Design a protein around this nucleic acid. Sequence first.
RNA 1: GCUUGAGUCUCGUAGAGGGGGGUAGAAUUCCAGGUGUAGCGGUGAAAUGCGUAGAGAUCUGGAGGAAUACCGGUGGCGAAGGCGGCCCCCUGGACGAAGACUGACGCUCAGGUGCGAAAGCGUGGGGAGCAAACAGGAUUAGAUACCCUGGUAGUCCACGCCGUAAACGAUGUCGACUUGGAGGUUGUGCCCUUGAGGCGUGGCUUCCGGAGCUAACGCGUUAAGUCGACCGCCUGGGGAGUAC
RNA 2: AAGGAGGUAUUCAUGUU
Lengths: 70, 104, 88, 129, 67
Amino acid sequence: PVIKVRENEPFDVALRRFKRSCEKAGVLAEVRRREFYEKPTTERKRAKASAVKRHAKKLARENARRTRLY
Amino acid sequence: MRHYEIVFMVHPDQSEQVPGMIERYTAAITGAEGKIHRLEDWGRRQLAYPINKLHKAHYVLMNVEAPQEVIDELETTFRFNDAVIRSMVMRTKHAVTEASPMVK
Amino acid sequence: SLSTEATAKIVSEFGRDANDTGSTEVQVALLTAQINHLQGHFAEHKKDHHSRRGLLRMVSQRRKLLDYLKRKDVARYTQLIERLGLRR
Amino acid sequence: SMQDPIADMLTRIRNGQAANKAAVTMPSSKLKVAIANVLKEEGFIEDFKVEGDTKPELELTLKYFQGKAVVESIQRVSRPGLRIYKRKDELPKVMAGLGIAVVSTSKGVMTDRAARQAGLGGEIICYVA
Amino acid sequence: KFCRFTAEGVQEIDYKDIATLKNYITESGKIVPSRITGTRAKYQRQLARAIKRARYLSLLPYTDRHQ
RNA sequence: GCUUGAGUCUCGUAGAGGGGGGUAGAAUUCCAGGUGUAGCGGUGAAAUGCGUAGAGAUCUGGAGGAAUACCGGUGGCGAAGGCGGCCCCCUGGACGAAGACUGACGCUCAGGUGCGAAAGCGUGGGGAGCAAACAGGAUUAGAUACCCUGGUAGUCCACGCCGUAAACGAUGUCGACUUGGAGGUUGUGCCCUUGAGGCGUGGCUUCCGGAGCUAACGCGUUAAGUCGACCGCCUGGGGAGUAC
RNA sequence: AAGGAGGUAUUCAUGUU
Ligand SMILES: [Mg+2]
Ligand SMILES: [Mg+2]
Ligand SMILES: [Mg+2]
Ligand SMILES: [Mg+2]
Ligand SMILES: [Mg+2]
Ligand SMILES: [Mg+2]
Ligand SMILES: [Mg+2]
Ligand SMILES: [Mg+2]
Ligand SMILES: [Mg+2]
Ligand SMILES: [Mg+2]
Ligand SMILES: [Mg+2]
């Protein structure tokens, strides 16, 4: 995130752009994830659980648009 | 015979030796019965990041069909020459005799 | 594996036309050629178990083919193993 | 590996009846044709036929009476792992004569009733109820 | 969506064709996901290899910081 | 004898399959300097520790070791263990298209042989980070722990040994039959490719579900359904996977 | 960190920037 201050843009706008660039690059998430060593088994288990619950929510939504609740 | 694609980057201050190297390596291959399909001197290009504090390295690209022994000898020549800053040889499935996007 | 020219050469040597590629002697000759070829590989790379397993599969398949040929026609079996220089 | 084609044939019959299929098809052999003839004459299948010169395919057209399958149970008795032979006195009674056991006697394959009438024993291919 | 390679009959991505890879790398220099770009998986793998080879040959930057 | 099972040949396809050798960048640490000054580090809060011999911070140069962000995916490969930067050399397996060839050459397998995470052991190197043991500081009624500051074996390499794991799908291998749906990945054929389309046909793979099965939970064409072949095991809990 | 919207997520051109 290398933000250049443009002409006539106020400081608030420049800071908003820099914040959005940092959030889009995802630096802080990387740092927080690399703060402590996580075992390969833990990484795999977390990945699998995330996939399972995401798929389950997608399937629940698809079922919901098939069965009325009212 | 295998088709090797060689891209080597030379020190910007040896741009005058770059024509000599091309002929020497091509002659090595041609004596080795290898065939030079493509040869594109890309020239002075600005590096995306500094290599040995250098910028603006001289790129040459050369697509060849030549035996492994001569190719390995050429790679050792690149290793032990201090004008070639970088090299990369890649096996290819077929000979490419088109014109690179750096010339297109 | 074996290059196309080598396979065609062996087929010509051991089969009774250019197009007989499945005969037992042809199969045994191809297996023997490949097995002999890999000995250098497994003399330099001695920790390549994943390839040595395929090598042992080749050896075992050659054994089964030689057993079938011996039990089916003894003359072809003797001629083949004498040409190839294999024990038993 | 396929090591009991007769058991495979009986299994296809059973599964086709459970899946309400009109007809089932299998690779042919003369033992299979004999068994299908016995079943047809005892009224357990509606028909059979053979199609093919080099690789014959046996087609059996199955029978249903009140929606339900005609063959209620059919189990291979003699199998490659355990062959069963019975003297004429010890021939089995399947469903107390309401069903039929297919016996391979020295004069061909027949039902247990036919073998007991002809005074012969043999191998017990299958029970049909 | 619209994987831009299948529609053009692309057989192999070229590490030399920088501009195309410039379309598929982000500002920081990391590879953009296929879930974002809509690229098919096979061309995504080819693209990753080509981008890494270009990074090695210094036609693309590993990161924005070094230069 | 035959060709349908099993194999061989032809052309391709994808792949973190394996072994060896190079190479790149980011980062950690250390060293040498330049600038610079009173803190740095850590915790819930502190202290031990580092620093006026100039630390921490910033810039440049160098050394070395280990691992490969993004791509990355209930994606792929492998018999399982497992495999992740890029390039080369050697090499194993799988799948598809059309055709030819051999002619049952097949399946399973006691004993036997081979491979087998991590820790561990022997000899010889290497050692940046992490870190059993250990040392110190805290917390606590106590704290031989959780937390903090350091830190040795070890992790890495070469060659041998070891032979075990919740080595798990807690599901032995092979073959045949039995309604469907939505997808993923990898091949291939046809039609108007009108433009990423439509219609087929093979491989592997995730979820839902019918009949059926099941004690139930649930499995459900990749079965735990209906069968065939061979192999391994079980016989109340404990003592005990212990003694000899 | 909190709140709203859209989706299983983008086509929405390029241009501009
Ligand atoms: Mg082969
Ligand atoms: Mg054993
Ligand atoms: Mg170890
Ligand atoms: Mg040791
Ligand atoms: Mg030691
Ligand atoms: Mg500690
Ligand atoms: Mg055990
Ligand atoms: Mg077990
Ligand atoms: Mg076996
Ligand atoms: Mg289900
Ligand atoms: Mg014991």
